[PDB]
C-alpha cells in the first residue's frame, strides 16, 4: 500500500542515485589519493597543498576531481579492496565483518571501479564472489530467525545485506501473521504514537 519508501540505493549501478540518502552516506566515506599537481589556497584543509601530497578525502570529491587523464590526483584503493583482503574474502566470506569494514561495502566497492584501476576486474570478481558466499547464510538467517533477537545475526552484515535481511524478515513475519490470522484485522497506523 501507500507506505513511505526511501529512494532506492543505486550504488551498484554505473552511477549512484542522486537523491539516495544511502548513496550520499556511502560516498561520504574517505578514499586515499596522491595529488598530481599543487593546489593553492587549500592548505587550511589539506597556503598551497604541494605536489605529490598523500591525502584521504571523500569519494564524491575524488570522483569530482578525477579526470581519466589523471591530471589533478591519482586514486588508490582502500586496504579492504586490495589483494590481501580479497584473499581473506576468498577464504570464507561468512566470517568477515562488513559492518566494521565500511558499512556500504558493496556500494563503495562498485563505485571504486569508476577510477579505472588496473585491478578493476579483480575487485568486481571479489565483490561478486563475496556476495555469492554470504547469500546462503543471509537467506537462512533472515527467513528462519522468527520472533527473536536478530542482533547477532545482523551484526556482521553490510547495509545492502541488512536490507536483504529485513526483506526476508518482513516476508517471514507477513506469512506467520497470515497463518495465525492476525493479518485480517484493520488497525491504526504507526502514527497513533502521536
Amino acid at each position: 500500500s501507500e507506505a513511505y519508501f526511501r529512494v532506492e540505493s543505486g550504488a551498484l549501478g554505473p552511477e549512484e542515485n542522486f537523491l539516495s540518502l544511502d548513496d550520499i552516506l556511502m560516498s561520504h566515506e574517505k578514499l586515499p589519493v596522491r595529488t598530481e599537481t599543487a593546489m593553492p589556497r587549500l592548505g587550511a584543509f589539506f597556503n598551497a597543498v604541494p605536489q605529490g601530497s598523500k591525502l584521504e578525502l571523500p569519494l564524491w570529491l575524488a570522483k569530482g576531481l578525477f579526470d581519466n587523464k589523471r591530471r589533478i590526483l591519482s586514486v588508490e584503493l582502500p586496504k579492504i579492496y586490495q589483494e590481501g583482503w580479497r584473499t581473506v574474502f576468498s577464504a570464507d566470506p561468512n566470517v568477515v565483518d562488513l559492518h566494521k569494514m565500511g558499512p556500504h561495502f558493496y556500494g563503495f566497492g562498485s563505485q571504486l571501479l569508476h577510477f579505472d584501476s588496473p585491478e578493476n576486474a579483480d575487485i568486481s570478481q571479489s565483490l561478486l564472489q563475496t556476495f555469492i558466499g554470504r547469500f546462503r547464510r543471509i537467506m537462512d538467517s533472515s527467513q528462519n530467525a522468527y520472533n527473536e533477537d536478530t542482533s547477532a545475526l545482523v551484526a556482521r552484515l553490510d547495509e545492502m545485506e541488512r536490507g536483504l535481511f529485513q526483506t526476508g524478515q518482513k516476508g517471514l513475519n507477513d506469512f506467520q501473521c497470515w497463518e495465525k490470522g492476525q493479518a485480517s484485522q484493520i488497525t491504526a497506523s504507526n502514527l497513533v504514537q502521536n
Partner: protein
Amino acid sequence: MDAAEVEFLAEKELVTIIPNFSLDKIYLIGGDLGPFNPGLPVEVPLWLAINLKQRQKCRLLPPEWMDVEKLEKMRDHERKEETFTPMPSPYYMELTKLLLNHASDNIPKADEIRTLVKDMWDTRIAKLRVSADSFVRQQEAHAKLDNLTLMEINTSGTFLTQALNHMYKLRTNLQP
C-alpha cells in the same frame, strides 16, 4: 503483494455448499450463481461459501482432493520427486486454511488433512530454498518453476528477486 492479497485471489476458487435456505439465481458480475435450494449441493466462490458458513446458512463440503488417501499419495509423490509436482489446487494452502478453520465440523479427518498439507508445504518450501541457493551459486540467468503456487512464490520471492537484482548488478558492473 501481501499474503492477504494471495488469500483474496484464493477466495475466488469454487467450492460446493449445501444451503439451508431458499434463493433463486443471483446474477453476480463475475458470473451468475445458484439457484440455492435447501439441502442440495451448489457450487459457489469460496468467499461466499465462508461468509454463508459464518452466518450459519450452509454446510461446506470438502473438495474432492481433501481426502486422506489422495493427500498421502500426493505427499509421497512430492517427497519422492525433486521438481515441484502438480498440486491438486493452485491455492491449496489458502483453501486448507480457510476451509478447515471455518468448517472443521463439516470436513471429516481435518487433522490428517491439515498435517498432510503442512507436509507438502514444508517439502515444497525446502525445494524452493534449494532452487534459490542453486540459482545464486551457479549464477543462473533464469529458472523454471512450473508447478509452484502463488502463495509459495509470494512467501520467499521478494527476498529472492531483490538478491538476484543485486547479483545481476554486481556481475554486470564492468560493462564498458
